[PDB]
Design a protein around this nucleic acid. Structure first.
Ligand SMILES: Cc1cn([C@H]2C[C@H](O)[C@@H](COP(=O)(O)NP(=O)(O)OP(=O)(O)O)O2)c(=O)[nH]c1=O
Ligand SMILES: [Mg+2]
Ligand SMILES: [Mg+2]
Length: 342
DNA sequence: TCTAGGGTCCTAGGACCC
DNA sequence: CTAGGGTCCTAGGACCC
C-alpha cells in the first residue's frame, strides 16, 4: 500500500548541544573535532562556521584556513547519548516502528498511527515541538511515502523545518531530482552517472535496466527503482550491531613495532569494556586489526575467531606489520571484532 | 588543506564443502 | 569419466553519521 514515513534529523547535532550548554557560543563560528596538533577532522560545525565553508570531515587545518577564528571543541559524547536516548523516547511516544540510523536520526513508520488524525505532518510537527521543549534542541523532518524521499525531504527545510512529499507530488519531484541527492549516491557514483550522461532521476527513468544491472549490479537496480520512486524498504526496529572497533590516529612516527604493540596494549582495555556491554561473555565470529599508512592507504586483517583475546590481536598485528607495512610509516592503529548473528 | 572515529552494506578473489 | 556450484573467508570500496 502507501505508507507514511517520517525521517527525523537533529540540526547541527553536536554543535547544537554545545551551544545549548554554552550560550557564549551560539553566534560565533564553532566546530567539534580534533586539533591539527593531533591531526584532527571536523565532526560538525554550526551555521556561522558553515558560512565560511567549514564542513564535516574537513581537515581542521583546512577549516582554520577558512575560518581563522573557528572555536574548536573536542566532543562531549555522553551529552549526545542522553539527547539521542531522549529523542528516541519521544519517538516511542508516537509509534513502535522506529529505525534509528544514528544518534540524531530515525525513520518512523507512522501509517497505522491514530495520533493526529492519521496525519504524518502534524505528527512530525509535534515530534519537533516536543523535542524543542524537552531538550532545547532543534530538529528537522521529512514526510514521504517511502524512506529515501523522507530522508531527502528531511534536508530540504533544515534547520528547524519540515518538508512533505505526497504520492501525487512524487513524479514531478523525481524528474528534476539530482541522483546525488539520493542516499547511497556519493561522489564516485554520481561522477560515474555524470560520465554516463545521467544527472537526474528523470534521466534514469528513460534508461535500460539491463545496462544499469551490468555496470552497477545491485546498485543499478536500486538506482532505477528509487528513480521510479520505488523504495520497498520497511522500517525495521529490530536492527542490531554487527561490529565494534577501537582505532586511533597519532601525530605519527611509529616505524618501530614496539610502538604499534604499545598502542595495541592501550587500545585493548577499551575494546573489552565496549564489547562487554553488549556481550558480557565476549562473543566474536571474527577478530582483527587495522593499520593505516603514511600514504593514507590502509589494510585490515581479520580471521575466524571464537572469543576476544589480546594475544591473538597482537600476533595478527605483528604479521600485518611484517608483511603489509612495506617500510611505510603508520599513522593509525585499530582493533575490530564482528559479532554473531541473532 | 594534508586528511577522525565510528559504523553500514556491497563485491569479489580465492578457499573450501559437497 | 581431474568438478562445477555454492558458501565461506577475507580484504577493500563506497557510503553514511
Ligand atoms: C557527517 C558527519 C557527522 N558526524 C557527527 C556530527 C553530527 O553532530 C552528527 C550528525 O551528523 P549529521 O546529521 O549528518 N550532521 P549535522 O546534524 O550536524 O548537520 P545538519 O544540521 O543535519 O545539516 O554526526 C561526524 O562525526 N562526522 C561526520 O562526517
Ligand atoms: Mg543527517
Ligand atoms: Mg543531523
Amino acid at each position: 500500500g502507501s505508507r507514511k514515513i517520517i525521517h527525523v534529523d537533529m540540526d547541527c547535532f553536536f554543535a547544537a548541544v554545545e551551544m545549548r550548554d554554552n550560550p557564549a557560543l551560539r553566534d560565533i563560528p564553532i566546530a567539534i573535532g580534533g586539533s591539527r596538533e593531533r591531526r584532527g577532522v571536523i565532526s560538525t560545525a554550526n551555521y556561522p562556521a558553515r558560512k565560511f565553508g567549514v564542513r564535516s570531515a574537513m581537515p581542521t587545518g583546512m577549516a582554520l584556513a577558512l575560518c581563522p577564528h573557528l572555536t574548536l571543541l573536542p566532543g562531549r559524547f555522553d551529552a549526545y547519548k542522553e539527547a539521542s536516548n531522549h529523542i528516541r523516547e519521544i519517538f516511542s511516544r508516537y509509534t513502535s516502528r522506529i529505525e534509528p540510523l544514528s544518534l540524531d536520526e530515525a525513520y518512523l513508520d507512522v501509517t497505522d498511527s491514530v495520533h493526529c488524525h492519521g496525519s504524518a505532518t502534524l505528527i512530525a510537527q509535534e515530534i519537533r515541538q516536543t523535542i524543542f521543549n524537552e531538550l532545547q534542541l532543534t530538529a528537522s523532518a521529512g514526510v514521504a511515502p517511502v524512506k529515501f524521499l523522507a530522508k531527502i525531504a528531511s534536508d530540504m527545510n533544515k534547520p528547524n523545518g519540515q518538508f512533505v512529499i505526497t504520492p501525487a507530488e512524487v513524479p514531478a519531484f523525481l524528474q528534476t531530482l539530482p541522483l546525488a541527492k539520493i542516499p547511497g549516491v556519493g561522489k564516485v557514483s554520481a561522477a560515474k552517472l555524470e560520465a554516463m550522461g545521467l544527472r537526474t532521476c528523470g534521466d534514469v527513468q528513460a534508461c535500460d535496466l539491463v545496462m544499469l544491472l551490468k555496470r552497477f549490479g545491485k546498485f543499478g537496480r536500486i538506482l532505477w527503482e528509487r528513480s521510479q520512486g520505488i523504495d520497498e524498504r520497511d522500517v525495521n526496529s529490530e536492527r542490531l550491531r554487527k561490529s565494534v572497533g577501537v582505532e586511533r590516529t597519532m601525530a605519527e612516527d611509529i616505524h618501530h613495532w614496539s610502538e604499534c604493540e604499545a598502542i595495541i596494549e592501550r587500545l585493548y582495555p577499551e575494546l573489552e569494556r565496549r564489547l562487554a556491554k553488549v556481550k558480557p561473555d565476549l562473543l566474536i565470529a571474527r577478530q582483527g586489526v587495522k593499520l593505516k599508512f603514511d600514504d593514507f592507504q590502509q589494510t585490515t586483517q581479520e580471521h575466524v575467531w571464537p572469543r576476544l583475546n589480546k594475544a591473538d590481536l597482537i600476533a595478527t598485528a605483528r604479521k600485518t606489520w611484517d608483511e603489509r607495512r612495506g617500510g611505510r610509516g603508520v599513522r593509525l592503529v585499530g582493533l575490530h571484532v564482528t559479532l554473531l548473528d541473532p
